[PDB]
Design an enzyme around this catalytic site. Structure first.
Site, PDB file in Angstrom:
ATOM      1  N   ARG A 141       0.831  -1.182   0.000  1.00 15.77           N
ATOM      2  CA  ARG A 141       0.000   0.000   0.000  1.00 15.77           C
ATOM      3  C   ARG A 141       0.885   1.258   0.000  1.00 15.77           C
ATOM      4  NH1 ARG A 141      -2.060   2.442   4.222  1.00 15.77           N
ATOM      5  NH2 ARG A 141      -3.556   4.144   3.946  1.00 15.77           N
ATOM      6  N   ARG A 163      -8.186  19.320   6.668  1.00 16.27           N
ATOM      7  CA  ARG A 163      -6.946  19.490   7.382  1.00 16.27           C
ATOM      8  C   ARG A 163      -6.805  20.868   7.959  1.00 16.27           C
ATOM      9  NH1 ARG A 163      -1.942  15.865   5.060  1.00 16.27           N
ATOM     10  NH2 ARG A 163      -3.030  13.930   5.631  1.00 16.27           N
ATOM     11  N   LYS A 175     -13.048   2.820   0.529  1.00 13.56           N
ATOM     12  CA  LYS A 175     -12.734   2.918   1.924  1.00 13.56           C
ATOM     13  C   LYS A 175     -14.001   3.354   2.662  1.00 13.56           C
ATOM     14  CE  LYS A 175      -8.719   4.518   3.160  1.00 13.56           C
ATOM     15  NZ  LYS A 175      -7.886   5.746   3.496  1.00 13.56           N
ATOM     16  N   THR A 227      -6.263  -0.701  10.110  1.00 11.12           N
ATOM     17  CA  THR A 227      -5.964   0.382  11.012  1.00 11.12           C
ATOM     18  C   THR A 227      -5.918  -0.064  12.472  1.00 11.12           C
ATOM     19  OG1 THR A 227      -6.574   2.184   9.495  1.00 11.12           O
ATOM     20  CG2 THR A 227      -6.662   2.642  11.870  1.00 11.12           C
TER      21      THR A 227
HETATM   22  O1  LIG Z   1      -7.656   3.801   6.327  1.00  7.58           O
HETATM   23  C1  LIG Z   1      -7.650   4.898   6.947  1.00  7.58           C
HETATM   24  O2  LIG Z   1      -6.901   5.915   6.620  1.00  7.58           O
HETATM   25  C2  LIG Z   1      -8.539   4.960   8.116  1.00  7.58           C
HETATM   26  O3  LIG Z   1      -8.768   3.939   8.793  1.00  7.58           O
HETATM   27  O4  LIG Z   1      -9.069   6.035   8.410  1.00  7.58           O
HETATM   28 MG   LIG Z   2      -8.915   7.188   6.586  1.00  9.44          MG
END
Ligand SMILES: O=C([O-])C(=O)[O-]
Ligand SMILES: [Mg+2]
Ligand SMILES: O=P(O)(O)OC[C@H]1O[C@H](O)[C@H](O)[C@@H](O)[C@@H]1O
Ligand SMILES: O=P(O)(O)OC[C@H]1O[C@H](O)[C@H](O)[C@@H](O)[C@@H]1O
Ligand SMILES: O=P(O)(O)OC[C@H]1O[C@H](O)[C@H](O)[C@@H](O)[C@@H]1O
Ligand SMILES: O=P(O)(O)OC[C@H]1O[C@H](O)[C@H](O)[C@@H](O)[C@@H]1O
Ligand SMILES: O=C([O-])C(=O)[O-]
Ligand SMILES: O=C([O-])C(=O)[O-]
Ligand SMILES: O=C([O-])C(=O)[O-]
Ligand SMILES: [Mg+2]
Ligand SMILES: [Mg+2]
Ligand SMILES: [Mg+2]
Lengths: 471, 471, 471, 471
Positions: D32, D73, D217, D275
């Protein structure tokens, strides 16, 4: 011993000396008086013989009044019985005549008005079959398409003809009356079509001021189309295969039976399976292999009770019919009494509690299950589950003992009315202890309710050992 | 159309002109030649009529040779038949005599040596019963305890009397011979007691140099005590309920049947249910409600085939018996063709692959399942699962087509030998397209094996649309 | 509210004013006093604070004495802490000496006797690892293979090598004594290896004349090799994952936990899941995603209770740790409280009845399940089933209320001793009514026994509406 | 070997010589590249190192481009970092400014336009929390309610408030471009909300003329509200627990994970769990007990792949993290690879056939399952079922081998384009034989289709022994 109940029809073969006693001694749980046949004196004498024998033996025996309904029949033949052979012509008429092989009378007086050429006429549930050729004035001219013997006042079935006749005729009303006042425990209504047909029966009961359980005889396509509603409106059902097999295609009945037995058990109503279960046995000392199979399959389907009609009413081996029916039921049950499971989890208080009671008893290898009931309803929701444990009903109303004689695997004990649940436990202990198969220390599960004397109030299970102070 | 197979016994009522044709046209899948009765010319003519009708109609019709076995029977009465009534005394003897109502002869020559007072004698699979009172010399003196008609040479059964006679007699061996050389597809052995009884049959076949499938007739307690081993040693079984119902208590048969059908299905062997399924129909144009139930229940038990004995061989409505049996089977199957599931997950390559093939077909709403087979074994492991999809067998050996006429829900097609699985696929497309009820683009699952023309080599499933290039 | 119980370990972070109060107010169900650290006055004052807050709030809070057990450790260093860095040589000795970097002592006095070159030594539950090179007389010479700081009296683990040490040390005996006289509800024994280890604990209790529930801490391979026997000999188990994760491969722990929870629930013993569930909350106001998953998974595994160790004893957000743990538990339970089913049908009277009672309550939409118990056995066999209904325990012995604070989903109510079923039921009505939460007419299921005041007398279920006459 | 796939995130800790190699050698299945951090040269060099080590070892290693998404951000602080302590006021503004302690900027330029008082702001995925007090002009005035350090460009999460921002940012579009031309196998899009978000991604791929697999995601409540539709519109999903745990209540995630894994498996799409699975391992050589549990539970939930983020990108034991993760996965799988069953029976051709193939293989104790696939769809419908048999994919398109490195338990083999069923089966034999562990005679089940070279051609299963004539 046996869990499945046996229903016998009474008649000429049960009139000879102490034969009713012999049937009760041989296993009869319910006596069916058929009101299609016989004279009020014949019924009354039969009913007395049952009460004597029930009371003389200790064996519960219910008494069922079967009402003829809108049955269509032939008249009398000059010969009393003739032979109708294939190829011959016969005239059935609305008109009064001296009855013969070439022209006979019938009870349905709209026959000529309602019968069209093409229509079929089945006699004795298919013993002979005719087709209508024409309507010549007040006669119906038919050609015999399957030949055989016919006798006086025999039943005829006109599949597909809209038959207009009341649910209860005046003969039916007058037999309901005579049977209610005679003391019968239950009543069966023939040719049921609607869930509201019981209302008419109920009405007469209310006039006379004495109500009993009403059984629906399922022998019409309308009945099967409204099966669930009929099973909820009536107290019991009988799968009346004879007429059902000529009103429907005879090949459809096996599955209707199975679907109707399941439906009774779902709603916790007794179901009787009837007609030609051991037909062979009218003339033969042993049945066929198909007949034995038919009985075993009625057991495995889950029938509360199986019935014999001609096999005991006019048969030659009426005792052997009852005896053999019991050996088969017993043979199946020795293997397993397990029945096809319910398609739902019980939701009624009484249903749920009787379910739990079954669980506990079986898991603890209890000696018996005991249920207290006012109407028999609590006891029937446990019966439907088919336990291998002895199921014993305790009740103060003696009629319920006779009503529960057609409910599966159930033995009843009449007791004085109690006003406290411990009183009830002592009563159980007393009754049970007088019995061969029971002893002190033995474990039993008791279902009960409070306040006692109230139907539906059942709310308590108790695990009790005979004679101990676990209360 | 129908999935359950119908087996008919041929006899005098099938010897009227072009009657065998009518049966095949009406649904007969297997023709049973009973070698108890008839002479070789009668059999030969019957066997030809089946081959003509099979070939003339396109319908597969297997031919089953039923060997009498160690059957014990009576002699011929001088009048040809008598009535034995309850209360009467009768002498059955080893001695040759002029036969009458008071003294008749029997085939079992150890009868006087082996029959003791107390023992019971049933005639005609139960219809008349005697009990032995004494042995005078070479007579057995009995009192008739159930009365009815007996006819010349009828079968008698001496329950739980150690009877010594060979599995196959000389008559049986000589009928095996005649039937093997006549061309029959299967053979049934009566009164099987051991799994090694097939060895004797096999031996004779090997001498004569032509083996076929051997069916075990289950009509002895020994058979049922060794049921699993008999079902593995024989190629098929018949639940032969007549003799089974007097050799065992008649109430035990319903459960033995069900247990035997399950066992056949488990090991993928055909099972026939036989005797009195529609007994009433010998004399009557319609059956009883018990008979209809018996047939429907043989279907729901999972029987590959149901059989008619007297109902077609000597009956009066042999056509209606076959027609009715099919209407009932069809009535049950329209509802559901579900059978009681197997108690195990298949272990054998052939079993596992046929299981998977069933899965795929049903899950993809396929039009048909197609299986290739040398011996039929692949096709039988799928038949036993009772799918609602058409099961179509493809084979190069024409005798397999007739052997698969008693396997459930299966239709066979004979094809030329192919030497590629590619070519098999196109063969299937060719044959299927010549059917009226098939079209190009239709979805079908095909089971096959490579190298082709090798038994048990099955190892491939192919999901194919008729005509298309998915190969 | 929440059903899953929370156990907190008390320590320095809980000693500031009314912090114990805050935990109880934030959901602590059991308070763990760890006897490895702290001194008797620290423990006593902590125990006082628990009983004040329990009593002041109405919340049951059990008090758990955790005994150090046969924990092996190092001696003291001159500097009190050193740093062992990779590549260095270190000598651990059975000899007396006050430690330094190069040579330090240990409490297991058979180290030199029982250690072979090749063995491993892990310090501080793993993070500093040495491998044994040689045994030179008294000393065990090792190489540091993963470096880091070692402090005084730090726990060391000799994975795989057989340690001989008594189940209870003299320190453990003397803390058992102090804790029994202080009035603790339960006791946990560390490093249990055998089902006989409870005998030792029991003996001391009998000397001291006060028995309590003994929890086995599962942190040894021997424990897991005798898991079933330990769960039957002990009253509860704790999956003590810290030491379990260095004594067994840390990758084996997830599955042992699940297998150990199943084993407790089956035999109806409470099970605690412990150590690092929310480890990161010692420094951080929120946990990791893994920690949150670990808690939710302890719930779905079926744990009676989850525990926090350092998170509350020395952590920075002891309140938040307890609060967070409860939000997660609650989040999972809102979804479904379903736990992995038992692999057996209950066989014990108390098991069978409590199962049935669950059935009835849930089927009848009951408001609560109410169970009477002397020791808590009946209540625990229902707790193990994980019902969504309120489970309410009724008992006369107030200590059992604290013992049942570690059993799943159970709220306890203390009542006077009753001498009547009537009495029992009226007490339930009183208690339940006095909550805002209950009203008269509300439906509940009550489990009880007679004769009252006897353990395992349990033999009745009662379906009762709050306030009504149905007893 | 292991069946569960391991995904590692690359970064500073992997930029040493032969560090990337070490991971691939230790088990990395997917690499990744996070496009939030680093520059194109850093990514390129990483990508080169993966392809060298993949190619040099023989291990398939997919390459995943993770796109930042509309991540909100902070701007830059004058000193690069400050410390916000509880009780302080801070102003976040949509105005341009260089940050300081009391006033810093943000990238979401609608903060002032649609932040309301009461809203919460988490910084650095939660460790610093602020609450919104007011909006003065274009500053958002907040109170620090949990203190801590903030640095330049730190991520902030506006839980609950609706953010309007495009599915793909302009940074993301030109990183998609750079990664597509670099030759990555898959792409992950962050902060997916809608099933239409992939359209955006697809469009850009079509402009640039290269599509790859797009992974969603799941880190938004909107995502989980449309979970089914997102799993059907996207090719894979990642349970992105970091942001998911601050955008949703952190307690809600464990069940969302389980529900999302089940949804992927049902529709046969790969799912990654990401994560903090072993967060502890950034500083420690061993994980926590919770972390180990979290990994084992992701396996038992049914995850195709588990991911490490900081543990390999910036951690101190990147190698040990990968090794540990694999030991645990392997430990769980040795016991049982059983996954929570599907809630449906497959009905797609390729689903049904891959199901049957699993059946056959397991029932026959096959050595391996072999599947031919153009896109990998067929292979993934078998992977989702979690068989203990080796699953081997055969494909002509080499990119699919890297795409299948994130699909459960699948090993891929690249082969030429074939036009022959025979060809394909011999190819299997060739390839398999080059492994020591496959020999001649070994039994394997092969899934394939014809016409070859067509996606969804799949329509055959073949049972084959290595080297034998069963073709
Ligand atoms: O994958 C990511 O960046 C998360 O879990 O927020
Ligand atoms: Mg994330
Ligand atoms: O589900 P159960 O409790 O067993 O009751 C089954 C059903 O039939 C009963 O006989 C009642 O008439 C219905 O009210 C009930 O819904
Ligand atoms: O159930 P299956 O594995 O398909 O096989 C069925 C069983 O009976 C068959 O007839 C074979 O003779 C047995 O060897 C086999 O085990
Ligand atoms: O049968 P159950 O009620 O489920 O109880 C299961 C077990 O529970 C306890 O541990 C008892 O000590 C055991 O004797 C019992 O077998
Ligand atoms: O029947 P299956 O092959 O298991 O497929 C079930 C579902 O999942 C697949 O991924 C497809 O996207 C759907 O179109 C399909 O209906
Ligand atoms: O009337 C009858 O006999 C019947 O149908 O049951
Ligand atoms: O032989 C027969 O006819 C039989 O057994 O059914
Ligand atoms: O002490 C404990 O509980 C442990 O080791 O986890
Ligand atoms: Mg009738
Ligand atoms: Mg026979
Ligand atoms: Mg410990």
């Amino acid at each position: 011993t046996r869990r499945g109940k046996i229903v016998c029809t009474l008649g000429p073969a049960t009139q000879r000396d102490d034969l009713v006693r012999a049937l009760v001694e041989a296993g009869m749980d319910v006596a069916r008086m058929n009101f299609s046949h016989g004279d009020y004196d014949d019924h009354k004498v039969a009913y007395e013989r049952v009460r004597v024998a029930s009371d003389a033996t200790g064996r519960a025996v219910g008494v069922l009044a079967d009402l003829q309904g809108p049955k269509i029949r032939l008249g009398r033949f000059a010969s009393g019985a003739t032979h109708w052979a294939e190829g011959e012509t016969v005239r059935i008429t609305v008109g009064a005549c001296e009855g013969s092989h070439d022209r006979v009378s019938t009870t349905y007086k709209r026959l000529a008005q309602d019968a069209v050429a093409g229509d079929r006429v089945l006699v004795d549930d298919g013993k002979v079959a005719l087709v209508v050729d024409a309507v010549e004035g007040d006669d119906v001219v038919c050609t015999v398409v399957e030949g055989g013997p016919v006798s006086d006042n025999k039943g005829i079935s006109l599949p597909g003809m809209n038959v207009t006749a009341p649910a209860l005729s005046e003969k039916d009303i007058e037999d309901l009356t005579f049977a209610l006042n005679l003391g019968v425990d239950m009543v069966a209504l023939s040719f049921v079509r609607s869930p509201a047909d019981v209302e008419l029966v109920h009405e007469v009961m209310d006039r006379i001021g004495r109500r009993v359980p009403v059984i629906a005889k399922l022998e019409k396509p309308e009945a099967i189309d409204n099966l669930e509603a009929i099973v909820l409106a009536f107290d019991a059902v009988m799968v009346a295969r004879g007429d059902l097999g000529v009103e429907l295609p005879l090949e459809e009945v096996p599955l209707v039976q199975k679907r109707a037995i399941q439906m009774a058990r779902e709603n916790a109503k007794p179901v009787i399976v009837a007609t030609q279960m051991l037909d062979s046995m009218i003339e033969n000392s042993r049945p066929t292999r198909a007949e034995a199979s038919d009985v075993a399959n009625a057991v495995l389907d889950g029938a509360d009770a199986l019935m014999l009609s001609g096999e005991t009413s006019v048969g030659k081996y009426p005792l052997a019919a009852v005896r053999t029916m019991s050996r088969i039921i017993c043979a199946v049950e020795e293997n397993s009494t397990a029945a096809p499971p319910l398609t739902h989890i019980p939701r009624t208080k009484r249903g749920v509690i009787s379910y739990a009671a079954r669980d506990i008893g079986e898991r603890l290898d209890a000696k018996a299950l005991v249920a207290f009931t006012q109407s028999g309803d609590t006891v029937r929701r446990l019966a439907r589950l088919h336990t291998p444990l002895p199921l014993l009903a305790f009740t103060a109303w003696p009629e319920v003992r006779s009503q529960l004689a057609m409910t599966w695997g159930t033995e009843t004990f009449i007791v004085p009315k109690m006003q406290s649940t411990d009183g009830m436990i002592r009563q159980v202990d007393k009754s049970l202890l007088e019995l061969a198969r029971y002893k002190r220390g033995d474990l039993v599960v008791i279902v009960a309710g409070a306040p006692p004397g109230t139907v539906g109030s059942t709310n308590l299970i108790h695990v009790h050992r005979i004679g101990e102070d676990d209360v």
